[PDB]
Amino acid sequence: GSHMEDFVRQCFNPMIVELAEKAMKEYGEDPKIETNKFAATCTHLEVCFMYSDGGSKHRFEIIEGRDRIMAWTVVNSICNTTGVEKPKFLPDLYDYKENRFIEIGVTRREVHIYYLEKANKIKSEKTHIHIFSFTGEEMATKADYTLDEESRARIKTRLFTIRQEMASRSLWDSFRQSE
Ligand SMILES: C[C@H](C[C@@H](C[C@H](C[C@@H](C[C@@H](CCN1CCCC1=O)N1CCCC1=O)N1CCCC1=O)N1CCCC1=O)N1CCCC1=O)N1CCCC1=O
Ligand SMILES: Nc1ncnc2c1ncn2CCNC(=O)c1nc([C@@H]2CCCN2C(=O)OCc2ccccc2)[nH]c(=O)c1O
Ligand SMILES: [Mn+2]
Numbered sequence: 001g002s003h004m005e006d007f008v009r010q011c012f013n014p015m016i017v018e019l020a021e022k023a024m025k026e027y028g029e030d031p032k033i034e035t036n037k038f039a040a041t042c043t044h045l046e047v048c049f050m051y052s053d054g055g056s057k058h059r060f061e062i063i064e065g066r067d068r069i070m071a072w073t074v075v076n077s078i079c080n081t082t083g084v085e086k087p088k089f090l091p092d093l094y095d096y097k098e099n100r101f102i103e104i105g106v107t108r109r110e111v112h113i114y115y116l117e118k119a120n121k122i123k124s125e126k127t128h129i130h131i132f133s134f135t136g137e138e139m140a141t142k143a144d145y146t147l148d149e150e151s152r153a154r155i156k157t158r159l160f161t162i163r164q165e166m167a168s169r170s171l172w173d174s175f176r177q178s179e
């Protein structure tokens, strides 16, 4: 295998690793080759799941982690349930409390840079955007951060723990440059 793949398997829990493998193979990418994107898929997955964990019991409909056609099935149902507009791109969550889809981003640049790319690419206006970084920074639409401070602070801490673990294994440099 590879050093990055070995690190991913001992860093994330097996359920996350399995969902990342499925999501990567579903789009023609092999986790054993594109190991940097393998780490980023695991990171993005865990962040979405910690995010959904931060709300109430039945607040978030998780979209990420499902297969493509079932994910769009849940989106069509949410749209016909509440009446919100069907987004052009697959989001990560839906907030039943605020009635909006959420796109979650985990970047290795300025949260402003990645927000600008995502906000211009989405072009749906209704989809709420929330970006985390590997340095503790976050940016969200209308400065509305959805969750309480304690839940967001846990995610940031986890991201920085992943960053330190990669550097100890001298993997962080190629990982930050691969994005
Ligand atoms: C035991 C516990 C594991 C976590 C798992 C949970 C993520 C997520 C799990 C899967 C369900 C699998 N599939 C396959 C298709 C149908 C389907 O449903 N997916 C992915 C798509 C949506 C979904 O449901 N789920 C399940 C319940 C709610 C949820 O979000 N979460 C949430 C926090 C971080 C994390 O990983 N659980 C289970 C419930 C409580 C909990 O925390 N562990 C092990 C040690 C650490 C830990 O937390
Ligand atoms: N190569 C593919 N690997 C898995 N899933 C893929 C994929 N191509 C498409 N999908 C499914 C639909 N896209 C997303 O869900 C999605 N995309 C994006 C960005 C922004 C523009 C395109 N993009 C992209 O290429 O994915 C990057 C990526 C990598 C790991 C984990 C999540 C995302 N950032 C999201 O935070 C996100 O959730
Ligand atoms: Mn997604």
Ligand SMILES: [Mn+2]
Pocket: 044, 092, 103, 104, 105
């Ligand atoms: Mn996302």
